[PDB]
Amino acid sequence: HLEEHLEKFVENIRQLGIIVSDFQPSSQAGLNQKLNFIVTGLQDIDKCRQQLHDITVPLEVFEYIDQGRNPQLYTKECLERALAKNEQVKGKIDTMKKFKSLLIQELSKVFPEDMAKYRSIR
Amino acid sequence: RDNLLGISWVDSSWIPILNSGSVLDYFSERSNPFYDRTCNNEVVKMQRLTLEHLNQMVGIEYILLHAQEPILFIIRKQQRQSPAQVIPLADYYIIAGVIYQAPDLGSVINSRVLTAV
Amino acid sequence: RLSTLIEFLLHRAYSELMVLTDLLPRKSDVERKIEIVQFASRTRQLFVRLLALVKWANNAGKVEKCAMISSFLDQQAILFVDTADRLASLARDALVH
Amino acid sequence: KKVKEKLSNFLPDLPGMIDLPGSHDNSSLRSLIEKPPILSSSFNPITGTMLAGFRLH
Amino acid sequence: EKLDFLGEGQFATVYKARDKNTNQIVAIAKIKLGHRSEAKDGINRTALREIKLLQELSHPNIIGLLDAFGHKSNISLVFDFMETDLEVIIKDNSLVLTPSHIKAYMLMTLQGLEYLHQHWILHRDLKPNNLLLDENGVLKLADFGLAKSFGSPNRAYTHQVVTRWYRAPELLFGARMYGVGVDMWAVGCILAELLLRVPFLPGDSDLDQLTRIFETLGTPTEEQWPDMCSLPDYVTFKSFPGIPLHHIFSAAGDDLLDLIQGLFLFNPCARITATQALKMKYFSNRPGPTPGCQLPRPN
Amino acid sequence: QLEMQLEKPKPVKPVTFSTGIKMGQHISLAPIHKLEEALYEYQPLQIETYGPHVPELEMLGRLGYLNHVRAASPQDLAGGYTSSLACHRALQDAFSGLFW
Amino acid sequence: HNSSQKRHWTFSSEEQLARLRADANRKFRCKAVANGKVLPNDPVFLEPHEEMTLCKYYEKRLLEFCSVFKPAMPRSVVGTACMYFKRFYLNNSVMEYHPRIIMLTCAFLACKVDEFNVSSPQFVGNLRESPLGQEKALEQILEYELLLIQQLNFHLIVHNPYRPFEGFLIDLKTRYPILENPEILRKTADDFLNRIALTDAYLLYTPSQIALTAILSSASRAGITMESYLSESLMLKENRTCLSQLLDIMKSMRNLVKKYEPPRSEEVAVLKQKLERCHSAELALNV
């Protein structure tokens, strides 16, 4: 929440500081370093806010961030693996359904009275 | 321990589960007269991982020499002074899951002549 | 777990900045500007990857539900294989004797 | 929908090459998320020596 | 002249370089503390102990406080730069692991321990690390922060100070008094690691670590040193059938088998002594301890 | 690459086989290796002093007396630190020096 | 101390100490004159013997302060502190660092080295001072703690004459039955030891020999002489030679003890007023 906007303002101040210290400056460019230290202090306040927030994140998010993609791709892949497991399990249960139907067909062919009493009892 | 040439050691369970990969393990079953705890294959199993470590730490390394898939699996005992330096100590051959020590061309002949004469 | 990583990132950033400020008067100032902008690139990369994290913090709970789904379906697959396994252990071990 | 949305539209506002991977960055500081750094010292206040060190040219 | 910034430390910061004087390489320490209180306790106890103990302990297997100054608030301690450390060396994937070399490392560590025990000053906290290897490879012991003297007068002896993994069994109980036992059991766990290649007993926190030590050596016998439960804090641990040393590290030469059995012996009284261990015939054997000229070096 | 690289030059000559066909191709054997480096720094006597002397185990009147300010005590004895360690430290330290 | 370390810091004979104290007095005098705050040889500058007398009376007061510490204190810690204090003024002058700051600091550093693990409330409770004034002193204590080690050459271990005493008495309970139940000997020896500690004995003589001489003086005072014990030590190297050295050291120790006396308070207050005025004089260091 607020940690995002705070660290974003910190990163933009860091970029402006890199731009200013990249350029020769008559004005006291120590204000850039002071704003960087104040951003570190506000990040400590945001770390208190992160103790308030208590986010738990898996490591593969960190690793896909290392690959430089969206973590949204990790969300799509977790959703895709969920649907892959659900597809496989529904397919196994569907083959068991077809096999049970075939078995009761063939046993009703070969044993009439017994499968009749079974279809009665169910 | 009287005469290592005159000892044979075996075990039925390991017999059906025997393959080129497991021959060293069968020699390693422990309580086997031919092999010893001092061998470094033991220090490797105690530690972790078996790779080019026999070329790194050089010493007593029992290694398979020649292998026939069903039964024949010959093992050689080497003493390394350094990498790329091998000194052969002895040879133990396993026939039908039965381990024997390869007789010297000369100790065998001496005993043989003695019995005949 | 992201709170601990946030605190550790802020600590490592402040400590590396302290080392940079310590060597700042020490380093030759013209190339020290280059070292400063290199360090600024380091901090920007740390902070943008933390920004990616706090972006994904909205999408955390759906991945938690996906982990629940995946565990459940893996459990049912192990149930199928266990049923077939116990039937094989019936048909080849207990009935032969 | 397309899920190859760049690491931009995601991290878009920050300047610099945000998309660039950690291996390409070659930064010791970046290697930190994978293994957490130890909090050896608490954050300290800014000092005059730092400003004297910088001050540009 | 500070020339390098190896990094910060647990209660210190280190820089590697040549001093105001000679060009020789040395590691320079800068004092680290929480000075925020307007009532600071001045310097920390760990620092005070470490500096004087290192200065006094001068041995080919002990590092020493050489030069020492402190014009500013800063206090500077001078210790010789070393190559690396045994711990990371054996921690890394087998680059060239070797027992004739493991035995040489053990010999240097034991000679250092004998000198420290003779000087009448226990090394309170040998941990796997905190042991340093130099370029020649002579290994001298280093971290001395937690050490204390051990003597006849009764005094509050510090407790639970040692790390859980290397805590002595008597310390794990909750014992108010102690002896060379802590250092001996700990060298013992470091040897264990060199042979096994991974840490011997893993304890997440006090009780779990005590349980795992007991599982590794079995329940201590009643004959061992009865009063093992009569020390101040004891909990009957699981009645393990017990495993021979042969079980945990599967094998090696039996002389090594004997040193291990001996450092381990449970009665603190019988834990083998430094002189006793050197005198063990294992050191004087056909396998030769490495001179250190051929000692293994990684990167 | 025909010149600087092997370019199958080693393919032309293989000398039948000396690894699979037969391991009796060794013939040219050699050794004569030496090192002469064993049993180094076994000796543990580094004893130093500028003082008189005292033995490690007491088994004497001092052990028989077994008396300190508080003598010895049982519960802490588990702690180890048998008074033995005690008198040894005490005497050794006292004897240390005596003649600058 | 076969443990070396103090082998370097064992000044050998009376004159060297006298000379060193004198030289530091000169050093401060000169630095100040050169700075040129004052014309040379003004009234304020002190004299070394007067400085030593002020130091001894104030040190007896410091020993009383160590004794009245609310938590029980091992004799080792008190001794460590006194030694540290004497050795500190062998390098500098009384004026450069006021004796009160030095005494309190030696005490805290000493406690930290000797592992007494003092509680912070216990230390503040013992001092009879206003909390604000005690905190002002504590701020100085911090800076002067680092300053102490700098001028102490970082040599912190101090050999305390106790351990040897317990040890010789155990040897007494075992090797010689000629004397018996030597505990009267124990208290008298303690009395001789405090008087020995007030002298430069710690600096000159070996501490083990100091304990042996205290035991010998106690024995002579009560009716026993240890020729036979001296004879067991003669059962050793140097053949006859060891005994003459032991006797000479014992005689010199007896002479210093008989000559040493507490400085009179009337004289001490005059000196105090002078020194107070002295530190109230303008030093000021640097910008």
Swiss-Prot record, chain A:
InterPro entries: Mediator_Med10 (IPR019145). It is found in: Nucleus. Keywords: Activator, Nucleus, Transcription, Transcription regulation. It comes from the Eukaryota. GO terms for cellular component: core mediator complex; mediator complex; nucleoplasm; nucleus; ubiquitin ligase complex. GO terms for molecular function: transcription coregulator activity; ubiquitin protein ligase activity. GO terms for biological process: positive regulation of transcription elongation by RNA polymerase II; positive regulation of transcription initiation by RNA polymerase II; protein ubiquitination; RNA polymerase II preinitiation complex assembly; somatic stem cell population maintenance. It holds the Pfam family Med10. Belongs to the Mediator complex subunit 10 family. PANTHER family: MEDIATOR OF RNA POLYMERASE II TRANSCRIPTION SUBUNIT 10. Component of the Mediator complex, which is composed of MED1, MED4, MED6, MED7, MED8, MED9, MED10, MED11, MED12, MED13, MED13L, MED14, MED15, MED16, MED17, MED18, MED19, MED20, MED21, MED22, MED23, MED24, MED25, MED26, MED27, MED29, MED30, MED31, CCNC, CDK8 and CDC2L6/CDK11. The MED12, MED13, CCNC and CDK8 subunits form a distinct module termed the CDK8 module. Mediator containing the CDK8 module is less active than Mediator lacking this module in supporting transcriptional activation. This is Mediator of RNA polymerase II transcription subunit 10. The gene is MED10.
From Swiss-Prot, chain D:
Component of the Mediator complex, a coactivator involved in the regulated transcription of nearly all RNA polymerase II-dependent genes. Mediator functions as a bridge to convey information from gene-specific regulatory proteins to the basal RNA polymerase II transcription machinery. Mediator is recruited to promoters by direct interactions with regulatory proteins and serves as a scaffold for the assembly of a functional preinitiation complex with RNA polymerase II and the general transcription factors. Belongs to the Mediator complex subunit 19 family. The chain holds residues 99 to 155 of 244 of the full protein. It comes from Homo sapiens. It comes from the Eukaryota. Component of the Mediator complex, which is composed of MED1, MED4, MED6, MED7, MED8, MED9, MED10, MED11, MED12, MED13, MED13L, MED14, MED15, MED16, MED17, MED18, MED19, MED20, MED21, MED22, MED23, MED24, MED25, MED26, MED27, MED29, MED30, MED31, CCNC, CDK8 and CDC2L6/CDK11. The MED12, MED13, CCNC and CDK8 subunits form a distinct module termed the CDK8 module. Mediator containing the CDK8 module is less active than Mediator lacking this module in supporting transcriptional activation. It is found in: Nucleus. This is Mediator of RNA polymerase II transcription subunit 19. The gene is MED19.
From Swiss-Prot, chain E:
It catalyses: L-seryl-[protein] + ATP = O-phospho-L-seryl-[protein] + ADP + H(+); L-threonyl-[protein] + ATP = O-phospho-L-threonyl-[protein] + ADP + H(+); [DNA-directed RNA polymerase] + ATP = phospho-[DNA-directed RNA polymerase] + ADP + H(+). Inactivated by phosphorylation. Repressed by roscovitine (seliciclib, CYC202), R547 (Ro-4584820) and SNS-032 (BMS-387032). The association of p53/TP53 to the CAK complex in response to DNA damage reduces kinase activity toward CDK2 and RNA polymerase II repetitive C-terminal domain (CTD), thus stopping cell cycle progression. The inactivation by roscovitine promotes caspase-mediated apoptosis in leukemic cells. Specifically inactivated by THZ1. The keyword Lyase does not apply. GO terms for biological process: cell division; DNA repair; positive regulation of transcription by RNA polymerase II; protein stabilization; regulation of cell cycle; regulation of G1/S transition of mitotic cell cycle; snRNA transcription by RNA polymerase II; transcription by RNA polymerase II. It is found in: Nucleus; Cytoplasm; Cytoplasm, Perinuclear region. One of its GO terms (cellular component) is transcription factor TFIIH core complex. Signal peptide: none annotated. The modification Phosphoserine is found at S152. Belongs to the protein kinase superfamily. CMGC Ser/Thr protein kinase family. CDC2/CDKX subfamily. This is Cyclin-dependent kinase 7.
Curated annotation (Swiss-Prot), chain F:
It comes from the Eukaryota. It is found in: Nucleus. Highest levels in colon and testis. Moderate levels are present thymus, prostate, ovary, and small intestine. The lowest levels are found in spleen and leukocytes. The modification Phosphoserine is found at S73. Associates primarily with CDK7 and cyclin H to form the CAK complex. CAK can further associate with the core-TFIIH to form the TFIIH basal transcription factor. Stabilizes the cyclin H-CDK7 complex to form a functional CDK-activating kinase (CAK) enzymatic complex. CAK activates the cyclin-associated kinases CDK1, CDK2, CDK4 and CDK6 by threonine phosphorylation. CAK complexed to the core-TFIIH basal transcription factor activates RNA polymerase II by serine phosphorylation of the repetitive C-terminal domain (CTD) of its large subunit (POLR2A), allowing its escape from the promoter and elongation of the transcripts. Involved in cell cycle control and in RNA transcription by RNA polymerase II. This is CDK-activating kinase assembly factor MAT1. It comes from Homo sapiens (Human). The chain holds residues 207 to 306 of 309 of the full protein.
